[PDB]
Amino acid sequence: SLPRMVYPQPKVLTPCRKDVLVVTPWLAPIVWEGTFNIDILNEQFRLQNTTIGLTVFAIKKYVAFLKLFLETAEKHFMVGHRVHYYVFTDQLAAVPRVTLGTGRQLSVLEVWQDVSMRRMEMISDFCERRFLSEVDYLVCVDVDMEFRDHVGVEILTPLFGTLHPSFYGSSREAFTYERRPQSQAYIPKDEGDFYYMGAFFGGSVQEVQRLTRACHQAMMVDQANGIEAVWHDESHLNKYLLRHKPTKVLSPEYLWDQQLLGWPAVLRKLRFTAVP
Amino acid sequence: FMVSLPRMVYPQPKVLTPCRKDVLVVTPWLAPIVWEGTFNIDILNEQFRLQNTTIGLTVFAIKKYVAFLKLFLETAEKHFMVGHRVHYYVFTDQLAAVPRVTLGTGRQLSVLEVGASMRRMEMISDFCERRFLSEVDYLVCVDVDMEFRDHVGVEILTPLFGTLHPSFYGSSREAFTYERRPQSQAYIPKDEGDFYYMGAFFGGSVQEVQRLTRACHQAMMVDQANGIEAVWHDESHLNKYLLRHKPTKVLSPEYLWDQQLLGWPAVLRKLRFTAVP
Numbered sequence: 175s176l177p178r179m180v181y182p183q184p185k186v187l188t189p190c191r192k193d194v195l196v197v198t199p200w201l202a203p204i205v206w207e208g209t210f211n212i213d214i215l216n217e218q219f220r221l222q223n224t225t226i227g228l229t230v231f232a233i234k235k236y237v238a239f240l241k242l243f244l245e246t247a248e249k250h251f252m253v254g255h256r257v258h259y260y261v262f263t264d265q266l267a268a269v270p271r272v273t274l275g276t277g278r279q280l281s282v283l284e285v286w287q288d289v290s291m292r293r294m295e296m297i298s299d300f301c302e303r304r305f306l307s308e309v310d311y312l313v314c315v316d317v318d319m320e321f322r323d324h325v326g327v328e329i330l331t332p333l334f335g336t337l338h339p340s341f342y343g344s345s346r347e348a349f350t351y352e353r354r355p356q357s358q359a360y361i362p363k364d365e366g367d368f369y370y371m372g373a374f375f376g377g378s379v380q381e382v383q384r385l386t387r388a389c390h391q392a393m394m395v396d397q398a399n400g401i402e403a404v405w406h407d408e409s410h411l412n413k414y415l416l417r418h419k420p421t422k423v424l425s426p427e428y429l430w431d432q433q434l435l436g437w438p439a440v441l442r443k444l445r446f447t448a449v450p
Numbered sequence: 451f452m453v454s455l456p457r458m459v460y461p462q463p464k465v466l467t468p469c470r471k472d473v474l475v476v477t478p479w480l481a482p483i484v485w486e487g488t489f490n491i492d493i494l495n496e497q498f499r500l501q502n503t504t505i506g507l508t509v510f511a512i513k514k515y516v517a518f519l520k521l522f523l524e525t526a527e528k529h530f531m532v533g534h535r536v537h538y539y540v541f542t543d544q545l546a547a548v549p550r551v552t553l554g555t556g557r558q559l560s561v562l563e564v565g566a567s568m569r570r571m572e573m574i575s576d577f578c579e580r581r582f583l584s585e586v587d588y589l590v591c592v593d594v595d596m597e598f599r600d601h602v603g604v605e606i607l608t609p610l611f612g613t614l615h616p617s618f619y620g621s622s623r624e625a626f627t628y629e630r631r632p633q634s635q636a637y638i639p640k641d642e643g644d645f646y647y648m649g650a651f652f653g654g655s656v657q658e659v660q661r662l663t664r665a666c667h668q669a670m671m672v673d674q675a676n677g678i679e680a681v682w683h684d685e686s687h688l689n690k691y692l693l694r695h696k697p698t699k700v701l702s703p704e705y706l707w708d709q710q711l712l713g714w715p716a717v718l719r720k721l722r723f724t725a726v727p
């Protein structure tokens with residue numbers, strides 16, 4: 175039960191965004207600026223005392239991206255809510271000392287085909303080991319990125335994927351799905367909804383555990399059949415979200431590369447961008 | 451429940467092509483507003499079939515209102531959840547006056563024998579415990595003096611839903627007929643409110659509905675002890691409940707219409723469930 179709140183009335187005959195699609199054929203919202211009242215969403219999620227887990231892999235040279243990642247996350251990611259950062263790394267001492275706000279904590283987790291399966295294997299394994307006990311939602315991203323604007327509770331849902339910024343306006347036959355029938359990730363040209371990027375996905379811990387476990391099993395079958403998918407775990411992620419439809423989809427606002435694509439008018443905010 | 455779909459053939463959705471240009475299709479709290487053109491029913495049907503879902507439909511037909519049953523059931527057989535398992539529940543004082551109707555495969559009807567204001571909320575709540583929790587997955591609760599004219603399907607199913615009143619979908623919150631006296635449990639001040647929902651069409655999961663109808667009943671009880679009656683009875687208490695507990699779906703006026711009073715505007719691409727004249 176929410177309390178008395180003061181906010182503008184939503185008008186039935188005034189569309190929120192006229193230049194984009196805001197809901198999927200399976201009735202999952204597509205998150206664009208102007209589709210959500212953040213204050214109503216903040217209060218709904220505060221009233222459940224929501225904790226958000228955020229995972230990143232920072233191994234080898236990739237430890238150098240952490241300072242800017244964590245500093246910008248403190249400015250922009252789930253501000254006002256409880257956050258638990260999880261850092262998979264081989265270099266404990268290289269993790270930068272970062273001042274974290276109230277309700278925010280960090281755990282370090284000290285850990286070619288092994289490399290390719292690592293991400294899906296390690297998220298799924300740690301779901302049983304730690305995540306189911308410690309957080310309500312899991313958010314998995316790349317570390318070579320920086321927050322520049324709001325990324326909050328509007329993304330939270332049982333299961334989500336994010337549109338690849340290079341393909342959001344492309345037709346299905348042009349998507350770089352795995353196209354060989356001998357692979358478990360196979361998607362023919364008369365199938366497919368969107369091309370989801372492997373750099374940003376999430377959901378409830380249970381649904382993330384299911385997705386990541388499933389992708390790992392399919393990868394192992396591929397290895398057994400002597401085949402390797404064209405874009406590795408990203409191919410398997412797309413095959414998964416085809417058959418198990420996400421309950422939200424995030425716009426390319428949430429994954430951008432300004433060097434490659436600039437700042438078109440269709441993006442009102444550039445929230446989470448690649449570091450060159 | 452996240453189900454696993456088979457290979458399916460259908461047109462690709464387009465990110466840069468708006469869904470409807472004329473209507474709001476998603477609430478400020480990211481709940482879909484269900485208009486025609488927002489959903490692909492092929493995909494949704496398979497999702498819900500893979501769950502083996504049973505839908506319960508409640509109607510109250512007490513005294514004279516029993517005359518409305520024949521038309522309601524015949525049209526429901528043609529339009530309500532066709533292809534899925536349905537369990538009709540008829541609350542009536544006259545079991546024998548229930549018309550003989552032929553039901554399709556996976557469709558059944560039980561009569562709930564009850565005696566002749568706070569009635570509907572309490573009785574729905576009570577029979578959740580007695581029958582509904584074991585027998586169905588979803589509960590859909592409607593007025594009997596109605597007919598089905600077009601498709602009403604799994605697109606409405608969600609943990610909690612309300613339907614926009616046909617008279618108020620284009621009104622400002624000040625014009626909504628909420629209970630306005632602070633003394634009532636149903637009280638809503640002029641600067642509050644998202645929509646005005648009609649008491650003739652609501653539902654959701656059995657657990658969420660059991661909770662809604664339970665809370666509304668005890669809220670009416672408190673009012674009764676203060677010697678007050680809400681302006682629109684159970685509908686007033688329903689609106690108070692849905693302002694503070696946001697629905698996970700909102701059904702458009704397509705799902706509750708009155709053509710005699712309101713005609714047929716352009717923004718309505720279908721009339722699915724309509725009042726009897």
Ligand SMILES: O=c1ccn([C@@H]2O[C@H](COP(=O)(O)OP(=O)(O)O)[C@@H](O)[C@H]2O)c(=O)[nH]1
Nearest residue numbers: 509510511512513514515592593594595650
């Ligand atoms: O004597 C009555 C009074 C009403 N009802 C039920 O209560 C609902 C609401 O009553 P009504 O339709 O008269 O209210 P309205 O929305 O038309 O103002 C009806 O649809 C019936 O299902 C009934 O069965 N018998």
Ligand SMILES: [Mn+2]
Nearest residue numbers: 593594595650
């Ligand atoms: Mn009625």
